[PDB]
Design an enzyme around this catalytic site. Structure first.
Site: not given
Length: 300
Positions: A41, A143, A145
């Site tokens: 993503h 932040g 991920c």
């Protein structure tokens, strides 16, 4: 002695964490050999999370749309790929800090060590268990991920989790390192939410063995129960059913304490029906289900 939620040493993963930017999104990537892995993503803009077609999004990107950064050293992407929900950026230089590793998928009820990361820089490490509903109770900020979870088996790093998102109850969802989600979660904007969870029974018994090994014995009793009877009570309290295989797995703990598993079960039954009456077990006022039998053996 003592018993405490313990994480694996993080040094071998720390040297793999990089920072991946694509457009106005930055998150963490995992750098092994000449490949960086990160949530796919990244290649999707916030304004488009509602309806992404990742196939199309990946056709419209070029190698130079991804800025990969290992500390101060910029890695140059020479290829880009998408395995299920994970993006694979092929880079020019193999990471020289690449440990022996494997990609393994874990079962609900197993635990692993999370290395929470921001901008490619590791910030904290802590143990998590895969809930029976395929979420983890972690701690992640914007932040995070691309943070990964892992176990260490004698210098070999078993990667089992990559962080992708935080569900609305405040728990966390992600994939294995093949990009296959744990549970019924998708990487697109939806009302998706954690399903109902259940208590991980075998682990609670592990933690009760840990407690007797540490001198907490006030819940032991002379009774023993049958497997089927215990399971009738367990289900009443939303505990997952106990199997013979679980019993066999607790063998080593039962032999170190000399308390048969079905004996401890009779102890757990009574705890479920009366509570603790103001006492604690290993410093907690609730039954803990996030230590596996192996986590206990490893600290005794």
């Amino acid at each position: 002695s003592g018993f405490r939620k313990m994480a694996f040493p993080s040094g071998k993963v720390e040297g793999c964490m990089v920072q991946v930017t694509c457009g106005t999104t930055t998150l963490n990537g995992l750098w092994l050999d000449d490949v960086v892995y990160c949530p796919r993503h990244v290649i999707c803009t916030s304004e488009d999370m509602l309806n992404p077609n990742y196939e199309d999004l990946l056709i419209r990107k070029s190698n130079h749309n991804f800025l990969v950064q290992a500390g101060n050293v910029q890695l140059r992407v020479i290829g880009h790929s998408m395995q299920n929900c994970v993006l694979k950026l092929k880079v020019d230089t193999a990471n020289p800090k690449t440990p022996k590793y494997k990609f393994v998928r874990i079962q609900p009820g197993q635990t692993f060590s999370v290395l929470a990361c921001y901008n490619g820089s590791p910030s904290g490490v802590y143990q998590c268990a895969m809930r029976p509903n395929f979420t983890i109770k972690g701690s992640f900020l914007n932040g995070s991920c691309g943070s990964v979870g892992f176990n260490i088996d004698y210098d070999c790093v078993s990667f089992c989790y990559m962080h992708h998102m935080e569900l609305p109850t405040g728990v966390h969802a992600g994939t294995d390192l093949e990009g296959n989600f744990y549970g019924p979660f998708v990487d697109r904007q939806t009302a998706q939410a954690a399903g109902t969870d259940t208590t991980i029974t075998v682990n609670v018994l592990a933690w009760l063995y840990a407690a007797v090994i540490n001198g907490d014995r006030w819940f032991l009793n002379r009774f023993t129960t049958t497997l089927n009877d215990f399971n009738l009570v367990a289900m009443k309290y939303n505990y997952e059913p106990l199997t013979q295989d679980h019993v066999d797995i607790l063998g080593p703990l039962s032999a170190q304490t000399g308390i048969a598993v079905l004996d401890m079960c009779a102890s757990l039954k009574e705890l479920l029906q009366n509570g603790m009456n103001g006492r604690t077990i290993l410093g907690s006022a609730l039954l803990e289900d996030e230590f596996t039998p192996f986590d206990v053996v490893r600290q005794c």
